[PDB]
């Protein structure tokens, strides 16, 4: 696995001011604006859940309402459930979801399967 | 006019929280607050490390 030609271990060692040379434009604008209190709260919650877990076992899920959250490369391996307005969806953070928001992993609408039309 | 039936549908709201009652707490007083107004009368509550005020909320170490 590699992301812009960078291996994940270097990404784990990749400094915060120099990840602003590596993401897309929207992600870099967000991290230059900085994360608010709730996103760091989720970060600390995920770090606690990953740290306080058996090594052979997947970590315990963390439920959240945060969909504005951008996936940092620290989170790979954490097991996160995210609300879509009605139901939590349980998702594993993969290596290939560094450049993605959480909210696009829980779809907030159901696909349209058209029924027979009424009187129009 | 036409009257409604008034459905019952009992839902128990008795389990409501009340804060704990400490009985005869005047035993343990006998730090004094050197404040502008609440001096010489008010006792200055203890944590594990630091004592906090109960009237003016001053900050110490």
């Amino acid at each position: 696995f590699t992301y812009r030609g960078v291996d994940l271990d270097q990404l784990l060692d990749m400094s915060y001011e120099q990840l602003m040379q590596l993401y897309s434009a929207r992600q870099r604008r967000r991290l230059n604006r900085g994360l608010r209190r709730k996103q760091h709260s989720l970060l600390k919650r995920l770090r606690k859940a990953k740290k306080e877990a058996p090594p052979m076992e997947k970590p315990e899920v963390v439920k959240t309402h945060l969909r504005d959250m951008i996936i940092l490369p620290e989170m790979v391996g954490s097991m996160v459930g995210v609300y879509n307005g009605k139901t939590f969806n349980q998702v594993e953070i993969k290596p290939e979801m560094i450049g993605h928001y959480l909210g696009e992993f829980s779809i907030t609408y159901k696909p349209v399967k058209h029924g027979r039309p009424g009187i129009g | 006019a036409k009257k409604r039936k008034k459905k019952s549908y009992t839902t128990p709201k008795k389990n409501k929280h009340k804060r704990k009652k400490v009985k005869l707490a005047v035993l343990k007083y006998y730090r004094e607050c050197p404040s502008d107004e609440c001096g010489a009368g008010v006792f200055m509550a203890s944590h594990f490390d630091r004592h906090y005020c109960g009237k003016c909320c001053l900050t110490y170490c």
Binding site: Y16, R33, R36, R37 | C56
Partner: peptide, 30 residues
């Protein structure tokens, strides 16, 4: 009584307010 009727601490609260207002987004902690 009815008809006859008619600093350091503020600076500490100020700096606590400024600390909390800086703490809504810290942008630095890693």
């Amino acid at each position: 009584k009815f008809y006859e009727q008619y600093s350091n601490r503020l600076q500490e609260v100020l700096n606590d307010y400024y600390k909390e207002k800086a703490e809504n987004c810290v942008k630095l902690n890693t």
